[PDB]
Design a protein around this ligand. Structure first.
Ligand code: CLA
Ligand code: CLA
Ligand code: CLA
Ligand code: CLA
Ligand code: CLA
Ligand code: CLA
Ligand code: CLA
Ligand SMILES: CCCCCCCCCCCCCCCC(=O)OC[C@H](COP(=O)(O)OC[C@@H](O)CO)OC(=O)CCCCCCCCCCCCCCC
Ligand SMILES: CC1=C(/C=C/C(C)=C/C=C/C(C)=C/C=C/C=C(C)/C=C/C=C(C)/C=C/C2=C(C)CCCC2(C)C)C(C)(C)CCC1
Ligand SMILES: CC1=C(C/C=C(\C)CCC[C@H](C)CCC[C@H](C)CCCC(C)C)C(=O)c2ccccc2C1=O
Ligand SMILES: CC1=C(C/C=C(\C)CCC[C@H](C)CCC[C@H](C)CCCC(C)C)C(=O)c2ccccc2C1=O
Ligand code: SF4
Ligand code: SF4
Lengths: 74, 73, 80, 43, 740, 166, 134
């Protein structure tokens, strides 16, 4: 049969946050041009990249997080 | 083939086989005495037309004989 | 090998010598008053017979004519 | 100008196309009403 | 760094250029001194590289030219949909799709065309179509004529917008070159929007409109009772009765509880038993899966914000030991030359069209296609033939790039430069494969044809005698049968019943059936590989030796399209890159002509045919393919002579036109031989003596007549040779199946 | 940042090392030195084959060649030839195999009796092979091919026919 | 013959055994600058600063190459004919002047004072060994 139902819990939110943290650490070193034209506020807190890399490294995190949440939910 | 695909395409193809034979290790021993070249233009018209005619002759002969002989009428 | 024959109707365009790939042709002077230029065929052994000279001749019909004949390694353009 | 447009119809294809269509239309017109003809009838 | 620069009022919009033909080039513009000017006016019309050296004018012409082309395709597609509205039996076909034939054309009551209007069911007398548009419109969820009428109007409106755009983008608002060179922006936009979002929207259509409509129509609901598409959006109770997944709403989507949507998003992986066709739910799950992939795939490239790759960096970093500098310099080629981009886009698009034909027959993706044997063959054949033509064009433009746009500085010890250096080894070995395959693949037919005539069937290469079983294909077949529950645990059925499984019978006819591979299929698959290799030999040799050869060192200065270089060097005829393309088209024909016959005879013999309720299948030809397809006489006897009976006897019936074009096609094929075998040297002499008669009667023409050029005479021949060739099989396939 | 982009265009980079080279040291020659053409494994094998081995007589070269081919050509005639499903199937293979050996020997003598042009040198074997550059050497090669060819086929006949006892 | 070979890794399109057995030609030229040029038979090469030398299988490959060098503004191209015995000859510009331009030392060769139209009919010349075009 199809995959069983999944009820949203804080565990799912934690996995999504952990996946983004992997992507941000991955995107920090890997990206060749983190800085860009749009400048975010308080760049020290965002590791010194702007709005474009913010949406990027958060997106691959969502892909990872999505992949893990459904992957673990066999 | 001989009526349509004229010479100068084939002559380039022959030059490649000459390279392979002169460069393959064991067949370097044996070699042509007469340099191999593509057939001339007038020759192909001869060789091609003979094929066109020999086929035109035989395949009708088999039809005429077998159709009549198969029925005998 | 092939024979390149050049006739009286030459006018001295020099185009035949340029179009030639094998340098079979050469422009020579005329003792006559016609011009200081006539085409020649000094080294006919290198003639391959590509008729490029006959494409660059602006006469009513060809002043320079290429007559095919006996073949050789050079006239057939065989690098093997 | 209008003169430039008239010459476009004057060219071979557009002139040949309009003429042959007018020519073809007449035959398709005649075969419609008068259906089939193989010989002129004899008085 | 991907800005939008647009020039203002580049060229006027006068009608004066229409009046003066030959405005392309300085030579044609001078005047029509001879009749060759007329033929040259057409052969150069779309050759913008010759008109102007300025690359901007080349790109602007091309970008506007595509728009006028899309207007043609939209007008064509709108006409099909319009004919489906007025002159069609679609509304009757929906009620009884199995026992009613599809028709969309009606000839007029004139000299005797009216016999062509034949009883196709539904009270409509017309020509039976084989394009399959009826199955398409049903899968789209169209259940009435007015709904089909509106779609036609939109295409015509859409056609005008494309036509307006090209005027707008060539006369008023012309982009500069660097707008076109932003390939990284071109790929993001085409991948995510055109392919990604375009697929995403279609998933919304299949879920809301098609899948409920198809489900109701499939469950016995009459078309009058089926609600309209808009009612599903307003009233959700209807969708919930059919697909209860909608009751949860959109909350399971965001919370990743995607199991709630298992009703209308599935992996059944098989055909619907009632209607031969893939489950619409899978087609909904299909496009939803791919849109995410395409949308993700597009973000790879940089496009002004620093996030992504330079394609130059990826190529230059893909070097290796055996390739010195690797792909260094290629990105400049694809960005510099339009021809190179055409060669890649045309070659791979052609291979898609062949791959599409193969997936569609084994996995019929529309309702009631499999029962319609007529629509399957005509679709499978048309797509292969299209892809064959495009693949040949890819080799032509590859040579045009090499003659015109190839720079030695850019391609310096790159991947392309090395290939040119050892072009001899590539061709000499490919030559060995062509002879090896031709001897083995085809000689085995001669051995069987010889042995059967001698009366030695024990020695044939047959299934009972000495046999060559395709064990590898039999094995790959077996894995796909066992993948459901094994390496595809969420799959209920095998992907296609062609690999295995069980017989599927939609009505009396069989939709799909396992295709057992015997010794006969072993030989034919090598025949196809044989004919494909020779086609590559002709075309690949055309590309590499287009620039130079040992016979002709300077082939570029002569051009891509030139007939010869004199009768020297033996004979230098058909040495150009053009003439190689001229030869490959004959082999592309011979390559693909066997493919359609291999498909036509096998499916008739092994797959298609009426099935009894007890479980007995009666194929059309009854196992004729196993023992007869191993000899040339069998293809002559059991396939050509036998199946062509309906064609010649079509006179005095609705299929009589097929027998005519079947016959008239033989004319054009032979008419081609007049040009291929003959030569201009004869024809200018005949025109000479005919001109004397006109000079006598003072009917002499001002434009002096001239015989067709050498390469043109070859061009006209292959045109007729393929036209008369393909059109023959077109009528043979149509009339044989429309009767059977 | 740059995992590999900084490493390119360096001689130390493994990608930049070149395996292919010009024939000998002159690039103007035709051939190209490749692993298939100029590797030590292929050079050892080809150069020490009977046709190319150093310090052998022309007769001894052909005997090694003929014994190989004679023992090879028995197979296709026996199992796949006519009368392959008969008691005398292996016998037909011995006669047919020797038939090719005779035609093969006849071809050698014809190419020999015609003054042969040369024996060529290549990358895989730099030296010329042997005294195959003369009318006399090729003739001795032919006489040796026929002896080994008949012997090899008999050996294949004896082993295959007597395989059950073995 | 003295000169530097243009640097290229090699190519199957090039000299064959006919070079060693029968004859080979060689083209020589001098450059102001090191550039890239397409070889006569496949590939590209980097010509050196001065006194370049290249061996070619046929004479056509050299004059075809000479036309390409002229587009790089190099007219001091010279061709030689190398026989297997090492004999070398100054073939293409036998006179220092190019063939297109005139020189006094040259003489007419195979000239017909008549026109092509005035050629003798072949029936007048048969069983004699003579040809009409003489
Ligand atoms: C409320 C959320 C939050 C908080 C508390 C912090 C807090 C911090 N971040 Mg942080 N960060 C955030 C959101 C946040 N950031 C987001 C949304 C991104 C981008 C997706 C980043 C990217 C980021 C980077 C790249 C770096 C930090 C660093 C730091 C440090 C400090 C503890 C830096 C660090 O390690 O210490 C200075 C650092 O290098 N963060
Ligand atoms: C803890 C890590 C983890 C684990 C255990 C799984 C487990 C699984 N993944 Mg998964 N995945 C992960 C991380 C993980 N994923 C991440 C990080 C991504 C993002 C790249 C994906 C993206 C992904 C896709 C795209 C697919 C899977 C699939 C699968 C299933 C197995 C498919 C197969 O061939 O066997 C299985 C439930 C497949 C699946 O579930 O099919 C039903 C499938 O199509 N995964
Ligand atoms: C050798 C060539 C040839 C010849 C001699 C004819 C001659 C004829 N055809 Mg024919 N035809 C041809 C080629 C030819 N056709 C071709 C190539 C095709 C298509 C493949 C046809 C298809 C065809 C059909 C289907 C029919 C004819 C008919 C006719 C006859 C009447 C035509 C008519 O109404 O006149 C035109 C009418 C006039 C009144 C003359 C007016 C003249 C001008 C325009 C007035 C101003 C006529 C005997 C018809 C026939 O036989 O009916 C009995 C008919 O039905 N033809
Ligand atoms: C609005 C009207 C209009 C007008 C007055 C012009 C006028 C002009 N255009 Mg233009 N153009 C228009 C609309 C117009 N265009 C549109 C809508 C497009 C987008 C497709 C273009 C795209 C375009 C390009 C790309 C180019 C021009 C060019 C030109 C100039 C030369 C055209 C010429 O002499 O050939 C006149 C040619 C024709 C009348 C034949 C056109 C054939 C049509 C488009 C296709 C028909 C397909 C048909 C269905 C095939 C059936 C085949 C079968 C049945 C036999 C001229 C100033 C050229 C130019 O400036 O030269 C430097 C140029 O390169 N135009
Ligand atoms: C691919 C384009 C295409 C093609 C090949 C056809 C082909 C055809 N159409 Mg058609 N049509 C098309 C697009 C097309 N249509 C579009 C886009 C529309 C909507 C604007 C229509 C609207 C339409 C109508 C309304 C009718 C046809 C008719 C016809 C038929 C007769 C043509 C005729 O008499 O020419 C005449 C040619 C000239 C006058 C020139 C023919 C089968 C007629 C038909 O089949 O009647 C039974 C008819 O009445 N068409
Ligand atoms: C995306 C597709 C595509 C595009 C954009 C081009 C574009 C081009 N091609 Mg090309 N080509 C293609 C596909 C394509 N080709 C394919 C698939 C092939 C293989 C068949 C070729 C083979 C090819 C050759 C061999 C040559 C070109 C050339 C050219 C250039 C000039 C052509 C010209 O002036 O047009 C005008 C062309 C014509 C007027 C020819 C008309 C041919 C007709 C349509 C054939 C009849 C078919 C028809 C369906 C029959 C039924 C109807 C009939 C009975 C009424 C131009 C850049 C030429 C070149 O050298 O480029 C610089 C050239 O010599 N092409
Ligand atoms: C039926 C007609 C026919 C045949 C048999 C061929 C055969 C061939 N063509 Mg071809 N060609 C043809 C028509 C044909 N062409 C036409 C009409 C055109 C114009 C479009 C071309 C254009 C064309 C091109 C452009 C090219 C070819 C190529 C080839 C060769 C491919 C190699 C191969 O298959 O191995 C040889 C296979 C055979 C000859 C098949 C039959 C052999 C049987 C099994 C063996 C004979 C039995 C026995 C030994 C007889 C002994 C008798 C004894 C008494 C002497 C081959 C010689 C390609 C080529 O040369 O690449 C290698 C190539 O590039 N052809
Ligand atoms: C063997 C597989 C290719 C393995 C292969 O290509 O090797 C690939 C190998 C890789 O070299 P590089 O690592 O330099 O390539 C790096 C790339 O990024 C540059 O393109 O290059 C070669 O050895 C050249 C040999 C080409 C010629 C090999 C023979 C090809 C035969 C024709 C294809 C047969 C297909 C049969 C199966 C369908
Ligand atoms: C792995 C490999 C391979 C394979 C191999 C093979 C497969 C082999 C061959 C095989 C062979 C081909 C073998 C053969 C052998 C033979 C023999 C074993 C012979 C025998 C002989 C004898 C013993 C004889 C004797 C005699 C004489 C001479 C005279 C008198 C009589 C008698 C009989 C006594 C190759 C190299 C390809 C490549 C690389 C790797
Ligand atoms: C294939 C082909 C070739 C290449 C073909 C060659 C080199 C012929 C090779 C055939 C060999 C010689 C075997 C033929 C043997 C015959 C069966 C018997 C001939 C012997 C008689 C004299 C008795 C051309 O040279 C050519 C030239 C001009 C137009 C078309 C073509 C052409 O189509
Ligand atoms: C027949 C033939 C010709 C001659 C073909 C010609 C001259 C075709 C002429 C086609 C049309 C019919 C010419 C006249 C077009 C007129 C404009 C038509 C009149 C207008 C009305 C129809 C409206 C070649 O030139 C040739 C060249 C090389 C290889 C083979 C051949 C070859 O086979
Ligand atoms: S007429 Fe011909 S031969 Fe005389 S100069 Fe001109 S091109 Fe040369
Ligand atoms: S045929 Fe060729 S080689 Fe002879 S003169 Fe003309 S161009 Fe020169």
């Amino acid at each position: 049969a199809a995959t069983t139902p999944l009820e949203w819990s804080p565990t799912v939110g934690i996995i999504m946050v952990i996946a983004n943290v992997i992507a941000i650490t991955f995107g920090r070193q890997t990206i060749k041009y983190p800085s860009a034209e749009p400048a975010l506020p308080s760049a020290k807190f965002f590791g010194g990249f702007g709005a474009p890399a913010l949406l990027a490294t958060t997106a691959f995190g969502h892909i990872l997080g999505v992949g893990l949440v459904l992957g673990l939910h066999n | 083939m001989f009526l349509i695909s004229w010479r100068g395409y084939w002559q380039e193809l022959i030059e490649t086989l000459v390279w392979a034979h002169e460069r393959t290790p064991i067949a370097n021993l044996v070699r042509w005495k007469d340099k191999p070249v593509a057939l001339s233009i007038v020759q192909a018209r001869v060789v091609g037309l003979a094929h066109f005619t020999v086929g035109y002759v035989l395949t009708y002969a088999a039809f005429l004989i077998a159709s009549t002989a198969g029925k005998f009428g | 090998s092939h024979t390149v024959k050049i006739y009286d109707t030459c006018i001295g365009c020099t185009q035949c010598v340029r179009a030639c790939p094998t340098d079979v042709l050469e422009m020579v002077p005329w003792d006559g008053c016609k011009a200081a230029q006539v085409a020649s065929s000094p080294r006919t052994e290198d003639c391959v017979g590509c008729k490029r000279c006959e494409t660059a001749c602006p006469t009513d019909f060809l002043s320079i004519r290429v007559y095919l004949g006996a073949e050789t390694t050079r006239s057939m353009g065989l690098a093997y | 100008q209008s003169s430039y447009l008239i010459k476009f119809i004057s060219t071979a294809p557009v002139a040949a196309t309009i003429w042959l269509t007018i020519t073809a239309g007449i035959l398709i017109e005649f075969n419609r009403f008068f259906p089939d003809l193989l010989f002129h009838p004899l008085p | 760094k991907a800005r939008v620069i647009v020039d203002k009022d580049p060229v006027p919009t006068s009608f004066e250029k229409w009046a003066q033909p030959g405005h392309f080039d300085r030579t044609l513009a001078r005047g029509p001194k001879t009749t060759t000017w007329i033929w040259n006016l057409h052969a150069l019309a779309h050759d913008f590289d010759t008109h102007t050296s300025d690359l901007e004018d080349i790109s602007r012409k091309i970008f506007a030219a595509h728009f006028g082309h899309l207007a043609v395709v939209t007008i064509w597609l709108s006409g099909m949909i319009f004919h489906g509205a007025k002159f069609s039996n679609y509304e009757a076909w929906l009620s009884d799709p199995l026992n009613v034939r599809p028709s969309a054309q009606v000839v007029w009551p004139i000299v005797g065309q009216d016999i062509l209007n034949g009883d196709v069911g539904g009270g409509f007398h017309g020509i039976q179509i084989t394009s399959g548009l009826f199955q398409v419109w049903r899968g789209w969820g169209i259940t009435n004529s007015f709904q089909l009428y509106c779609t036609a109007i939109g295409g015509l409106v859409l056609a005008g917008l494309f036509l307006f755009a090209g005027w707008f983008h060539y006369h008023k608002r012309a982009p500069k070159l660097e707008w076109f060179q932003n390939v990284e922006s071109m790929l993001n936009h085409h991948l995510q929007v055109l392919l990604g979002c375009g697929s995403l929207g279609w998933a919304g259509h299949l879920i809301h409109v098609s899948a409920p409509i198809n489900k109701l129509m499939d469950a016995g609901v009459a078309v009058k009772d089926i609600p309209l598409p808009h009612e599903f959006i307003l009233n959700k109770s209807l969708l919930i009765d059919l697909f209860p997944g909608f009751a949860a709403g959109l909350t399971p989507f965001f919370t990743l509880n995607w199991g709630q949507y298992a009703d209308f998003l599935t992996f059944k992986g098989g055909l619907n038993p009632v209607t031969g066709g893939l489950w619409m739910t899978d087609i909904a799950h299909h496009h939803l899966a791919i849109a995410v992939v395409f949308i993700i795939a597009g973000h790879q490239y940089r496009t002004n914000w620093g996030i992504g790759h330079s394609i130059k960096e990826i190529l230059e970093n893909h070097k290796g030991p055996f390739t010195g500098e690797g792909h260094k310099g290629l990105y400049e080629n694809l960005t510099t030359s339009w021809h190179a981009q055409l060669a890649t886009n045309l070659a791979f698009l052609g291979s898609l069209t062949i791959i599409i034909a193969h997936h569609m027959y084994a996995m019929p993706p529309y309702p009631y296609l499999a029962t319609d044997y007529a629509t399957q063959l005509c679709i499978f054949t048309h797509h292969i033939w299209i892809g064959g033509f495009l693949i040949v064009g890819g080799a032509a433009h590859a040579a045009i790039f090499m003659v015109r746009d190839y720079d030695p500085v850019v391609n310096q010890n790159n991947v392309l430069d090395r290939v040119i250096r050892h072009r001899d080894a590539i061709i000499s070995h490919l030559n060995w494969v062509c002879i090896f395959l031709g001897f083995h693949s085809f000689g085995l037919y001669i051995h069987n044809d010889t042995m059967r005539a001698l009366g030695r069937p024990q020695d044939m290469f047959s299934d009972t005698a000495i046999q060559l079983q395709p064990v590898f294909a039999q094995w790959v077949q077996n894995l796909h049968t066992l993948a459901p529950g094994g390496t595809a645990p969420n799959a209920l059925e095998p992907v296609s019943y062609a690999f295995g499984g069980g017989v599927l019978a939609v009505g009396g006819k069989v939709a799909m059936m396992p295709i057992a591979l015997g010794t006969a299929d072993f030989l034919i698959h090598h025949i196809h590989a044989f004919t494909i290799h020779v086609t590559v030999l002709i075309l690949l040799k055309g590309v590499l030796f287009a620039r130079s050869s040992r016979l002709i060192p300077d082939k570029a200065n002569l051009g891509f399209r030139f007939p010869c270089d004199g009768p020297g060097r033996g004979g230098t005829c058909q040495v150009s890159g053009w003439d190689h393309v001229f030869l490959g088209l004959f082999w592309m024909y011979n390559s693909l002509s066997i493919v359609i016959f291999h498909f036509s005879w096998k499916m008739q013999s092994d797959v298609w045919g009426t099935v009894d309720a007890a479980g007995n299948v009666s194929h059309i030809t009854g196992g004729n393919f196993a023992q007869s397809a191993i000899t040339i006489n069998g293809w002559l006897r059991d396939f050509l002579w036998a199946q062509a009976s309906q064609v010649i006897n079509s006179y005095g019936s609705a299929l009589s036109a097929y027998g005519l074009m079947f016959l008239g096609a033989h004319f054009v094929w032979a008419f081609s031989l007049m040009f291929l075998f003959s030569g201009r040297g004869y024809w200018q002499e005949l025109i000479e003596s005919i001109v004397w008669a006109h000079n006598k009667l003072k009917v002499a023409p001002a434009i002096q007549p001239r015989a067709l050029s050498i390469t043109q005479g070859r061009a006209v021949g292959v045109a007729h040779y393929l036209l008369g060739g393909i059109a023959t099989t077109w009528a043979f396939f149509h009339a044989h199946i429309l009767s059977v | 940042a740059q995992a590999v982009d900084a490493s390119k265009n360096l001689p130390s980079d493994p990608r930049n090392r070149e395996v292919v080279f010009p024939a000998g040291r002159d690039p103007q020659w035709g051939n190209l030195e490749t692993p298939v053409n100029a590797s030590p494994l292929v050079k050892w094998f080809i150069n020490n084959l009977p046709a190319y081995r150093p310090g052998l007589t022309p007769f001894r070269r052909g005997l090694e060649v003929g014994m190989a081919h004679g023992y090879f050509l028995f197979g296709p005639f026996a199992k796949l030839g006519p009368l392959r499903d008969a008691a005398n199937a292996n016998l037909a293979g011995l006669l047919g195999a020797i038939g090719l050996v005779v035609l093969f020997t006849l071809a050698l003598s014809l190419y020999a009796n015609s003054n042969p042009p040369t024996a060529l040198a290549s990358v895989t074997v730099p030296n010329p092979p042997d005294a195959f550059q003369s009318k006399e050497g090729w003739n001795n090669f032919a006489s040796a091919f026929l002896i080994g060819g008949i012997g090899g086929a008999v050996v294949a006949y004896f082993l295959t026919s007597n395989l059950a006892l073995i | 013959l003295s000169g530097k070979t243009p640097l290229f890794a090699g190519s199957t399109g090039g000299l064959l055994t006919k070079a060693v057995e029968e004859e080979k030609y060689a083209i020589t030229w001098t450059s102001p600058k090191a550039q890239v040029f397409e070889l006569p038979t496949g590939g590209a090469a980097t010509m050196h600063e001065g006194e370049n030398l290249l061996y070619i299988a046929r004479k056509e490959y050299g004059i075809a190459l000479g036309g390409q060098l002229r587009k790089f503004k190099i007219t001091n191209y010279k061709i030689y004919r190398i026989l297997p015995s090492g004999e070398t000859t100054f073939i293409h510009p036998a006179d220092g002047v190019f063939p297109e331009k005139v020189n006094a030392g040259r003489e007419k060769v195979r000239f017909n004072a008549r026109s092509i139209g005035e050629n003798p009919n072949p029936s007048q010349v048969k069983f004699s060994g003579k040809a009409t075009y003489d």
